[PDB]
Amino acid sequence: PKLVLVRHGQSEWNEKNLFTGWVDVKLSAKGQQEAARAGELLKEKGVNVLVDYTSKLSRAIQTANIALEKADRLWIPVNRSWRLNERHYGDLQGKDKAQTLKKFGEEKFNTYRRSFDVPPPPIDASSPFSQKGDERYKYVDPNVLPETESLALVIDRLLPYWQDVIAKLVGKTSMIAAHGNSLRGLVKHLEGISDADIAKLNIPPGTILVFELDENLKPSKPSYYLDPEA
Amino acid sequence: PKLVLVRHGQSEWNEKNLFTGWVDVKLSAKGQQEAARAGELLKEKGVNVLVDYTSKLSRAIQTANIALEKADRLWIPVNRSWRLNERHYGDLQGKDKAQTLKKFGEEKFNTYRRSFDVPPPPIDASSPFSQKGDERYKYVDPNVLPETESLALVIDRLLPYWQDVIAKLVGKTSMIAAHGNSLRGLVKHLEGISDADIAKLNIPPGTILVFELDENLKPSKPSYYLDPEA
Amino acid sequence: PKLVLVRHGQSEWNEKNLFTGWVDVKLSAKGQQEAARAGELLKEKGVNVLVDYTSKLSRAIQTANIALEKADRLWIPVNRSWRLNERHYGDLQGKDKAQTLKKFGEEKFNTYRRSFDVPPPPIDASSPFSQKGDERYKYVDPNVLPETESLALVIDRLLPYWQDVIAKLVGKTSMIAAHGNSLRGLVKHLEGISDADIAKLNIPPGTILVFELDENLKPSKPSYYLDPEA
Amino acid sequence: PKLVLVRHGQSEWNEKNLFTGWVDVKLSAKGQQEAARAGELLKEKGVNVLVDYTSKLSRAIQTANIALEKADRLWIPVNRSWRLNERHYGDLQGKDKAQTLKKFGEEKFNTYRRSFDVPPPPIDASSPFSQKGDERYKYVDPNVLPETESLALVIDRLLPYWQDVIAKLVGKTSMIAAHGNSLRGLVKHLEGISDADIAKLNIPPGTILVFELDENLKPSKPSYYLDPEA
């Protein structure tokens, strides 16, 4: 029926000047714009959107919330969870995607997150660049919120809720924004790729995408990016 | 604990050039601004906001969604219903709050909505300025969506869900934006006034307000408008 | 589609030896039996049952829970509310439907609950035969739980949730047991009768009934009692 | 706070005369009894029970539903999922825990389900002793419902929902019946054992048990079986 796969913008942290994280720190102008653009895209092009889901974060939300205002809806239930986020970086943060790179350089910078057995180093509870129990988060076995996090285990964050909650209604129209890897995650498991695949398709923020599927959610009709030339 | 009573902005229909309605048609710039302002208000001043509710409409939402982005949250469950809207006008629409006034003038213009036994004339299903079953709406006994609507019966829209759903969690922090009359409605029943009262306190959009209450939701600590001088 | 209208059994309080109430005190053997019978009825006859609702009470539940076990289901979501109960008696209780009758006798005994402007006398919080905040109940504006209660206002208990929650899914199969008056209530508003009507059709517990309806929930196909000769 | 860990009865299939399965086929008399007993146990002994969960199955439910009626509640929300069942047998069924045993005998009979890399053989969709999409089940990525199933992967059925949904409220009292392995599953991951452990503690149906925990759900106060001598 409908899979609306949207990758936010570029936040305003890491991006711009290298850093960012699972941290949750809004996003610049491109967001609103690109997002509004995407919002512009689903509607204007065609289709509308029945149900929406967000990795309990402001960043992504901005993207999602905006699209809706312009298409001409805004009105609808919405569902917020913690199974839809950017792969927790490791023990880095700030960095600048330079000194880090400058330091170790190599596949290390590239590989770290990527495949497995080596996500970014963990993360202690004595670095403002973590993410623990900001209210919210503590309505979940505290024995959860990760530590390093990869798009692998990430598969699970995606997996349970996917079949469970959304997979439930999807007998209709629903949209789960997320971005960076989640969406990769959604498709990655979804399509073919193969754990070694994906690793090579960041995915265009702003714009928006649909899978189509049917009953047993295997993608019949391919994938449309509204702006294939985006 | 917390009652966050927020009256949107001024849409961009009626307002500006007289008209508007239960119709659902976004809002101008003041909205984003005033709203962002309010959003600015809850947070900046103090407090934060646990749970949010909207009369399944884009207008109000804009106001609500914005405040959240600036305070610095955006992240949280949110609940959308159809028991939180602007008192359906009657059989007017467009008007211009002039010819209508110009035409009948008198308490008629003033009184129509106001008290009772005379809401605006009903409304047929052959005027683009109605509101029937835009998707959504038809997940409700169709034998519902009003026709004229006053802030009286409106009391009920407010009443059932109020005690039922929100009244449920309010053992914590929650915010239900709405505006125009709903909020009047929330307080009107809530405080003293007396059906003949309220009728004289439109309430400042943008800004935001808290009741305080306790257990049996009777307003102990009075009401704060963040900007008493707003 | 489906309205399954079931009136419990006869509890084991009032019934048997005159008394009973909104109190919530299980039910005798006929319940299990009659209920199982009804349970027997929906299934055996035909149909099955998608969704179930109960006036947060053990009495009715017994009836509902049983039917399900025998038809051969038991498995399914279920929804419990406080908008589905027996019209709170007044200030009587125990009584015995004799001394009370013996005392005032007249339409008083008969009329009390019945129509209006005279439900049973209220009820204070110093008679074990009330019902206040047994856990549960206090997840509702405390400024609720009635006091006397009639099948009139009762209409409202029925009304909000009816259109709101169930009325939502009923685009499928759902069953809301209740009994005594609720069901009267469900039909009473539903059909014709006329406030002065109903008052003359207690309705067979045990057995079970279906309305049929369609879209705008007006009863197309009449009403089947599985056992018309019950 | 409260973990109520209850292992049904003994159904009435496999048990009695060897067979049974993930199939879902009620239970004999001991159930009602033992269950009622357990129901008897939580209440009578002490405590009460705030929230209840069932592996969308009649068998277990019978057990759960009964306890409640006798303790003296029955009234409360209840939550039904498909993440709480008996480890799907494999490709056997009926059997009789004799010919099967008689046939292969050995750890094969004993080991099959047990640890891993050898659950019971799968199961095709041409044996009435499977379990596919009995209504219900098809509100889940169809690409789910297992095939063989072990108490290992089973860990996951337990895992997602556990932290997600219940783990949510457990800041209070809740009970998730299930049985056979689920409960093993609940504790198995929960305590120490070690994949090779559990394998040696079937757990007493009927009766009921509590863990206690706290915040980060690690079992402070040990485990009480109401009837240690049961």
Side-chain angles (χ1 to χ4, degrees):
Chain A
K2 270 15 233 169
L3 226 207
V4 264
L5 249 293
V6 173
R7 170 209 188 135
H8 83 358
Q10 52 139 355
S11 12
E12 123 273 19
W13 222 49
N14 199 65
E15 270 91 14
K16 240 184 193 184
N17 96 219
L18 321 164
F19 283 171
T20 205
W22 208 78
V23 346
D24 172 83
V25 20
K26 235 111 263 116
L27 101 185
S28 74
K30 267 142 186 206
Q32 351 185 8
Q33 236 153 231
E34 326 246 70
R37 172 153 176 212
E40 213 162 4
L41 295 208
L42 342 140
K43 119 142 190 206
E44 146 165 291
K45 238 213 163 165
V47 41
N48 299 299
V49 158
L50 285 222
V51 311
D52 146 47
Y53 296 76
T54 78
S55 172
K56 250 154 182 179
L57 292 138
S58 232
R59 259 173 240 333
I61 298 62
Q62 319 218 108
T63 306
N65 267 233
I66 293 121
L68 293 297
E69 69 185 328
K70 274 140 219 291
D72 261 339
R73 283 268 206 106
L74 221 66
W75 75 237
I76 196 238
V78 95
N79 258 277
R80 247 125 223 170
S81 45
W82 73 258
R83 314 244 161 200
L84 250 55
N85 323 324
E86 212 3 284
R87 77 151 313 201
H88 215 147
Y89 252 106
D91 155 74
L92 21 111
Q93 216 12 286
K95 285 21 223 162
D96 177 74
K97 324 210 131 304
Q99 272 82 210
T100 325
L101 143 60
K102 154 162 146 176
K103 284 183 58 172
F104 319 90
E106 250 91 280
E107 205 211 285
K108 289 64 126 86
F109 187 90
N110 318 261
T111 158
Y112 247 35
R113 56 81 181 93
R114 106 186 165 155
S115 244
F116 54 58
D117 236 303
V118 306
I123 197 242
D124 4 36
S126 56
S127 42
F129 299 145
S130 219
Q131 13 278 152
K132 177 76 250 165
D134 180 15
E135 295 208 85
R136 63 170 79 146
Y137 290 6
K138 94 140 162 172
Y139 268 27
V140 220
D141 336 355
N143 257 273
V144 143
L145 293 39
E147 75 206 40
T148 294
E149 229 200 66
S150 146
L151 193 215
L153 33 162
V154 194
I155 160 294
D156 290 334
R157 287 187 254 28
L158 206 36
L159 230 82
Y161 194 29
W162 149 266
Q163 53 212 212
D164 250 276
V165 136
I166 137 269
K168 182 183 49 151
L169 316 109
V170 109
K172 76 169 60 187
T173 320
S174 111
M175 95 157 106
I176 84 357
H179 136 78
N181 243 281
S182 71
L183 266 351
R184 279 229 284 160
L186 245 168
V187 333
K188 189 256 152 186
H189 146 278
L190 226 88
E191 316 192 312
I193 62 278
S194 132
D195 292 347
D197 238 22
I198 36 192
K200 68 175 93 161
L201 251 325
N202 334 68
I203 331 324
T207 34
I208 92 311
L209 56 115
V210 325
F211 270 78
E212 202 87 57
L213 321 147
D214 74 76
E215 341 214 39
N216 323 294
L217 325 165
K218 249 232 169 169
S220 37
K221 237 48 157 151
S223 52
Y224 333 138
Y225 256 123
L226 278 265
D227 238 49
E229 273 179 335
Chain B
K2 270 15 233 169
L3 226 207
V4 264
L5 249 293
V6 173
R7 170 209 188 135
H8 83 358
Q10 52 139 355
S11 12
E12 123 273 19
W13 222 49
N14 199 65
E15 270 91 14
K16 240 184 193 184
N17 96 219
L18 321 164
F19 283 171
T20 205
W22 208 78
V23 346
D24 172 83
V25 20
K26 235 111 263 116
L27 101 185
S28 74
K30 267 142 186 206
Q32 351 185 8
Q33 236 153 231
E34 326 246 70
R37 172 153 176 212
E40 213 162 4
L41 295 208
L42 342 140
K43 119 142 190 206
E44 146 165 291
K45 238 213 163 165
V47 41
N48 299 299
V49 158
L50 285 222
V51 311
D52 146 47
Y53 296 76
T54 78
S55 172
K56 250 154 182 179
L57 292 138
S58 232
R59 259 173 240 333
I61 298 62
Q62 319 218 108
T63 306
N65 267 233
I66 293 121
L68 293 297
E69 69 185 328
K70 274 140 219 291
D72 261 339
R73 283 268 206 106
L74 221 66
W75 75 237
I76 196 238
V78 95
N79 258 277
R80 247 125 223 170
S81 45
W82 73 258
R83 314 244 161 200
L84 250 55
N85 323 324
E86 212 3 284
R87 77 151 313 201
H88 215 147
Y89 252 106
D91 155 74
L92 21 111
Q93 216 12 286
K95 285 21 223 162
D96 177 74
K97 324 210 131 304
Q99 272 82 210
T100 325
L101 143 60
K102 154 162 146 176
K103 284 183 58 172
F104 319 90
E106 250 91 280
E107 205 211 285
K108 289 64 126 86
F109 187 90
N110 318 261
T111 158
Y112 247 35
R113 56 81 181 93
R114 106 186 165 155
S115 244
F116 54 58
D117 236 303
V118 306
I123 197 242
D124 4 36
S126 56
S127 42
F129 299 145
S130 219
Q131 13 278 152
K132 177 76 250 165
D134 180 15
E135 295 208 85
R136 63 170 79 146
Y137 290 6
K138 94 140 162 172
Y139 268 27
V140 220
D141 336 355
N143 257 273
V144 143
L145 293 39
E147 75 206 40
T148 294
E149 229 200 66
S150 146
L151 193 215
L153 33 162
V154 194
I155 160 294
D156 290 334
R157 287 187 254 28
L158 206 36
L159 230 82
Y161 194 29
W162 149 266
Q163 53 212 212
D164 250 276
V165 136
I166 137 269
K168 182 183 49 151
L169 316 109
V170 109
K172 76 169 60 187
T173 320
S174 111
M175 95 157 106
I176 84 357
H179 136 78
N181 243 281
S182 71
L183 266 351
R184 279 229 284 160
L186 245 168
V187 333
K188 189 256 152 186
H189 146 278
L190 226 88
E191 316 192 312
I193 62 278
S194 132
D195 292 347
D197 238 22
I198 36 192
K200 68 175 93 161
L201 251 325
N202 334 68
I203 331 324
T207 34
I208 92 311
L209 56 115
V210 325
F211 270 78
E212 202 87 57
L213 321 147
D214 74 76
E215 341 214 39
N216 323 294
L217 325 165
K218 249 232 169 169
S220 37
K221 237 48 157 151
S223 52
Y224 333 138
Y225 256 123
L226 278 265
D227 238 49
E229 273 179 335
Chain C
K2 270 15 233 169
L3 226 207
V4 264
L5 249 293
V6 173
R7 170 209 188 135
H8 83 358
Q10 52 139 355
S11 12
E12 123 273 19
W13 222 49
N14 199 65
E15 270 91 14
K16 240 184 193 184
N17 96 219
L18 321 164
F19 283 171
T20 205
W22 208 78
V23 346
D24 172 83
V25 20
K26 235 111 263 116
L27 101 185
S28 74
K30 267 142 186 206
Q32 351 185 8
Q33 236 153 231
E34 326 246 70
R37 172 153 176 212
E40 213 162 4
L41 295 208
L42 342 140
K43 119 142 190 206
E44 146 165 291
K45 238 213 163 165
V47 41
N48 299 299
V49 158
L50 285 222
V51 311
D52 146 47
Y53 296 76
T54 78
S55 172
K56 250 154 182 179
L57 292 138
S58 232
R59 259 173 240 333
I61 298 62
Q62 319 218 108
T63 306
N65 267 233
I66 293 121
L68 293 297
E69 69 185 328
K70 274 140 219 291
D72 261 339
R73 283 268 206 106
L74 221 66
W75 75 237
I76 196 238
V78 95
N79 258 277
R80 247 125 223 170
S81 45
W82 73 258
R83 314 244 161 200
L84 250 55
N85 323 324
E86 212 3 284
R87 77 151 313 201
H88 215 147
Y89 252 106
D91 155 74
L92 21 111
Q93 216 12 286
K95 285 21 223 162
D96 177 74
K97 324 210 131 304
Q99 272 82 210
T100 325
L101 143 60
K102 154 162 146 176
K103 284 183 58 172
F104 319 90
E106 250 91 280
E107 205 211 285
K108 289 64 126 86
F109 187 90
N110 318 261
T111 158
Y112 247 35
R113 56 81 181 93
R114 106 186 165 155
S115 244
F116 54 58
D117 236 303
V118 306
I123 197 242
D124 4 36
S126 56
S127 42
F129 299 145
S130 219
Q131 13 278 152
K132 177 76 250 165
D134 180 15
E135 295 208 85
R136 63 170 79 146
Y137 290 6
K138 94 140 162 172
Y139 268 27
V140 220
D141 336 355
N143 257 273
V144 143
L145 293 39
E147 75 206 40
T148 294
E149 229 200 66
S150 146
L151 193 215
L153 33 162
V154 194
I155 160 294
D156 290 334
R157 287 187 254 28
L158 206 36
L159 230 82
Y161 194 29
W162 149 266
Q163 53 212 212
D164 250 276
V165 136
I166 137 269
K168 182 183 49 151
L169 316 109
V170 109
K172 76 169 60 187
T173 320
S174 111
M175 95 157 106
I176 84 357
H179 136 78
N181 243 281
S182 71
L183 266 351
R184 279 229 284 160
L186 245 168
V187 333
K188 189 256 152 186
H189 146 278
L190 226 88
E191 316 192 312
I193 62 278
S194 132
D195 292 347
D197 238 22
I198 36 192
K200 68 175 93 161
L201 251 325
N202 334 68
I203 331 324
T207 34
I208 92 311
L209 56 115
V210 325
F211 270 78
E212 202 87 57
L213 321 147
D214 74 76
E215 341 214 39
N216 323 294
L217 325 165
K218 249 232 169 169
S220 37
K221 237 48 157 151
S223 52
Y224 333 138
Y225 256 123
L226 278 265
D227 238 49
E229 273 179 335
Chain D
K2 270 15 233 169
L3 226 207
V4 264
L5 249 293
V6 173
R7 170 209 188 135
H8 83 358
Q10 52 139 355
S11 12
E12 123 273 19
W13 222 49
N14 199 65
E15 270 91 14
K16 240 184 193 184
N17 96 219
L18 321 164
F19 283 171
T20 205
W22 208 78
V23 346
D24 172 83
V25 20
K26 235 111 263 116
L27 101 185
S28 74
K30 267 142 186 206
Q32 351 185 8
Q33 236 153 231
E34 326 246 70
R37 172 153 176 212
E40 213 162 4
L41 295 208
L42 342 140
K43 119 142 190 206
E44 146 165 291
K45 238 213 163 165
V47 41
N48 299 299
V49 158
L50 285 222
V51 311
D52 146 47
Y53 296 76
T54 78
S55 172
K56 250 154 182 179
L57 292 138
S58 232
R59 259 173 240 333
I61 298 62
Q62 319 218 108
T63 306
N65 267 233
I66 293 121
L68 293 297
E69 69 185 328
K70 274 140 219 291
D72 261 339
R73 283 268 206 106
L74 221 66
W75 75 237
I76 196 238
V78 95
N79 258 277
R80 247 125 223 170
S81 45
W82 73 258
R83 314 244 161 200
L84 250 55
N85 323 324
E86 212 3 284
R87 77 151 313 201
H88 215 147
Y89 252 106
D91 155 74
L92 21 111
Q93 216 12 286
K95 285 21 223 162
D96 177 74
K97 324 210 131 304
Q99 272 82 210
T100 325
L101 143 60
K102 154 162 146 176
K103 284 183 58 172
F104 319 90
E106 250 91 280
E107 205 211 285
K108 289 64 126 86
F109 187 90
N110 318 261
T111 158
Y112 247 35
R113 56 81 181 93
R114 106 186 165 155
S115 244
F116 54 58
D117 236 303
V118 306
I123 197 242
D124 4 36
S126 56
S127 42
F129 299 145
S130 219
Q131 13 278 152
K132 177 76 250 165
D134 180 15
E135 295 208 85
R136 63 170 79 146
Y137 290 6
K138 94 140 162 172
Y139 268 27
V140 220
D141 336 355
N143 257 273
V144 143
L145 293 39
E147 75 206 40
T148 294
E149 229 200 66
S150 146
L151 193 215
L153 33 162
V154 194
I155 160 294
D156 290 334
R157 287 187 254 28
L158 206 36
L159 230 82
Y161 194 29
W162 149 266
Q163 53 212 212
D164 250 276
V165 136
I166 137 269
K168 182 183 49 151
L169 316 109
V170 109
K172 76 169 60 187
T173 320
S174 111
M175 95 157 106
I176 84 357
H179 136 78
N181 243 281
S182 71
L183 266 351
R184 279 229 284 160
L186 245 168
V187 333
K188 189 256 152 186
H189 146 278
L190 226 88
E191 316 192 312
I193 62 278
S194 132
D195 292 347
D197 238 22
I198 36 192
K200 68 175 93 161
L201 251 325
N202 334 68
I203 331 324
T207 34
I208 92 311
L209 56 115
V210 325
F211 270 78
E212 202 87 57
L213 321 147
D214 74 76
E215 341 214 39
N216 323 294
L217 325 165
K218 249 232 169 169
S220 37
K221 237 48 157 151
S223 52
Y224 333 138
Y225 256 123
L226 278 265
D227 238 49
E229 273 179 335

